[PDB]
Amino acid sequence: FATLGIDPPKGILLYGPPGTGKTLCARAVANRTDATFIRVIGSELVQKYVGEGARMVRELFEMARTKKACIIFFDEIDAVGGARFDDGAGGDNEVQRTMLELITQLDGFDPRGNIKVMFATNRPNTLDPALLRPGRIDRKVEFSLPDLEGRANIFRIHSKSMSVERGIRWELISRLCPNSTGAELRSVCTEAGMFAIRARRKVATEKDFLKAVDKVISGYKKFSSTSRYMQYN
């Protein structure tokens, strides 16, 4: 990019619905990076004292100058992110001061920055609308529900594991399963191997795959799931 003389995106955006494997993409980049990776918990920034959370922000950006070419990651930024307004709680001003230090340490007076910043949460609605504004974030990628062609590769990457009978077409299994999160797709292959124990089978067959459709999906339809449950709150 130095030939064209452009500015690479400093921040990124990954939210999506819960259960799409967003944290898998965070650990996949750290493998190819071969450098320092930092994963920050949304409840780690807020400490047991008032004002210590402002120090927690400077702890992260201080190592950016010490350790060059690293990656910082924030998990569940909703419990961090501000714009909670004021009225009626009286204590909401302690959380927003963490972002005011986070925004200042990110975009300050002196435009100090080197590495890439990753914001990740399952609640895009409660986030600060100023936080979603560009210049602290450029690339915005929101995960969606894999289609018939998208869910096909989910069972193919899991076909190399476990035991798969020769001649079984996984395109019919993903087609009977409706649109859902990726976390429930891996549960199908996990439960498919569990039918052979009770049903007295050698390896997982096509008959045991159809039972997982009415078990992993149709049987678990009562709560204990997202599957586009929370769009906003």
Binding site: A83, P124, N125, L127, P129, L132, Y232
Partner: protein
């Protein structure tokens, strides 16, 4: 994004805008692209039809109102039939009561009064369909640009649709050309074909993708579809 007030049209934003009105403008921006222009004695509209498959058909983006006037479709397709029905009733109401043809200038205020009642009251919604009103009366040829926000302004020509504002540069440099062309419908339509060609990105103009309608003094409103526009390609 996707914050503040998404709920209703009767609640004002803290910045002095309306999100529901701004969201309705995004339907035209991402909708089907179309251009248009007019001369003293004539007016020409050009539309680019789309579809979801190669084996499917192409819906008409121009609905005939009366013999002397018509409109164009952009943004939301199904909401066009609602405003087209209320517009054709007003055209026939003037013929059965005042026995006069509805003027283009007065036709813009009629559709503006229909869309303002849904924005100012709960339960209704502004129609996100774009409308280009052309016609000829004793005053002359007139063209209007309809928006969900209620903006009605007479223009020589404009473009509404996907990447349609990128085709307005050709209309500005040629602004002094087509306005002096009177009684030449062949060379006047070619001015609109070269305008939409600047907005072409993936594919180009074909037989079924080109829809041209012309209205004038000696030539009434006529929709040219299929191979009728093959000579102007």
């Amino acid at each position: 994004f996707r914050n503040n007030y998404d709920g209703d049209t009767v609640t004002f934003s803290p910045t002095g805008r309306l999100f529901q009105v701004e969201y309705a403008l995004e339907a035209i921006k991402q909708g089907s692209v179309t251009v248009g222009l007019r001369s003293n004695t004539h007016a020409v509209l050009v539309a680019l039809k789309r579809n979801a498959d190669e084996l499917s058909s192409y819906q008409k983006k121009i609905i005939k109102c009366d013999e002397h006037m018509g409109l164009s479709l952009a943004g939301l397709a199904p909401d066009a039939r609602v405003l087209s029905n209320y517009l054709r009733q007003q055209c026939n109401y003037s013929s059965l009561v005042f026995n006069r043809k509805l003027a283009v200038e007065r036709a813009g205020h009629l559709l503006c009064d229909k869309a303002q009642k849904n924005t100012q009251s709960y339960g209704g919604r502004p129609y996100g369909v774009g409308l280009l009103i052309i016609g000829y009366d004793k005053s002359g040829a007139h063209l209007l640009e309809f928006q969900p926000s209620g903006n009605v302004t007479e223009l020589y020509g404009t473009a509404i649709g996907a990447r349609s504002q990128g085709a307005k540069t050709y209309l500005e440099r040629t602004l002094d050309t087509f306005i002096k062309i009177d009684g030449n419908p062949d060379e006047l339509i070619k001015a609109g074909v070269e305008a939409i060609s600047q907005s072409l990105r993936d594919e180009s103009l074909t037989v079924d993708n080109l829809s041209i309608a012309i209205v004038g003094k000696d030539t009434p409103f006529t929709i040219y579809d299929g191979e009728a526009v093959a000579k102007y390609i």
